[PDB]
């Protein structure tokens with residue numbers, strides 16, 4: 001536990017959060033990150049944290065989840081924070097404002113957040129030019145083990161979701177190491193309902209056709225991001241279509257529209273997706289189920305409620321090859337990234353694993 005770690009968690013972050021509502025704080029965090037105004041990330045990544053998956057090398061398995069850098073403004077500052085990979089978005093085809101404010105809420109007693117941003121997005125064209133301005137720098141980062149993902153959304157007024165996602169593949173696919181199709185945002189009408197098995201097969205067939213049409217060095221992996229709120233039938237159907245079509249991986253999970261018993265925050269009954277600690281074990285159980293339904297042959301990125309090495313390793317043993325976090329960054333600040341990495345390496349050694357790779361799916365072999 002470095003000095004920075006306790007100072008940020010016990011003094012600095014609680015003070016700033018006391019002065020700034022969550023949306024204003026989010027905006028200032030993006031600005032400061034984009035300018036490089038961050039503490040020293042001292043942790044050096046060891047060989048045991050390296051993972052090779054989705055056609056790329058990841059120097060460590062801890063990424064920043066979608067929704068923090070929605071518009072691609074802070075990618076290099078996020079690598080400087082120590083993340084092994086960065087995912088931007090969600091990005092919609094046209095710019096759109098999102099839902100009226102207030103639309104973000106903190107539940108500090110639960111280590112949780114509720115949000116109904118509604119896909120506020122600068123749009124594909126603005127994000128395209130931002131990534132083009134650093135495209136070759138990113139190629140060098142990716143070669144050195146720091147890949148980039150892009151998360152694709154749809155506009156609120158769209159009549160055909162599949163054409164929204166196709167446009168995103170055509171415009172940002174050539175700039176991404178992997179693309180994400182959300183079947184799971186809680187704050188757009190009809191989005192998650194993209195589950196009708198034949199409809200989902202139609203959607204993903206069109207996405208993969210568009211992807212396969214891109215030139216070889218600009219052809220990304222394609223992943224599906226799902227909610228934790230699916231029925232057992234929904235999960236069976238998703239696993240089936242994913243294997244049938246050759247989808248490259250899954251992200252598990254988005255926020256939940258459930259409200260687990262025991263939440264204490266005054267704002268627990270606000271509409272929106274809940275993230276952070278109340279989501280942690282629901283997300284881990286969804287990883288465990290999707291890994292089994294796909295026979296361990298489809299890489300999973302595990303996400304929901306991760307703030308320690310134990311949280312990360314539980315998801316890896318359940319089936320994740322990589323993990324992401326977001327809500328913990330908002331309460332701990334930048335030092336949380338090195339904390340998770342240091343604790344994960346210690347636990348791997350304690351449990352007798354040679355590295356991250358040896359622990360993926362290990363609970364299923366017991």
Ligand SMILES: Cc1cc2nc3c(=O)[nH]c(=O)nc-3n(C[C@H](O)[C@H](O)[C@H](O)COP(=O)(O)O)c2cc1C
Pocket residue numbers: 065066067068070089090104113115117119151182225253254255275276277279303304305306324325326327328
């Ligand atoms: C404020 C906020 C905005 C988010 N926006 C997006 C988004 O645009 N697209 C997406 O796929 N997930 C979005 N997410 C979900 C996260 O990517 C992640 O799946 C979820 O928050 C669980 O991780 P966590 O508990 O570590 O925060 C958002 C989450 C939060 C808290």
Ligand SMILES: Cc1cc(NC(=O)c2c(O)nn3ccccc23)c(C(C)C)cc1Oc1ccccc1
Pocket residue numbers: 012013016017021022023025026027028029032037038039104106113329330333334
């Ligand atoms: C990494 C980070 C995050 C945040 N905060 C948020 O992002 C945030 C929040 O506070 N609530 N929230 C709800 C939904 C979504 C986001 C949020 C803040 C604010 C408290 C200013 C600062 C941050 O970086 C620092 C901290 C110290 C020194 C240098 C950089």
Ligand SMILES: O=C(O)c1cc(=O)[nH]c(=O)[nH]1
Pocket residue numbers: 067090115116117118119120182184185186187254255273
């Ligand atoms: O409201 C959004 O933009 C949003 C919130 C969230 O939790 N997940 C997502 O995919 N989008």
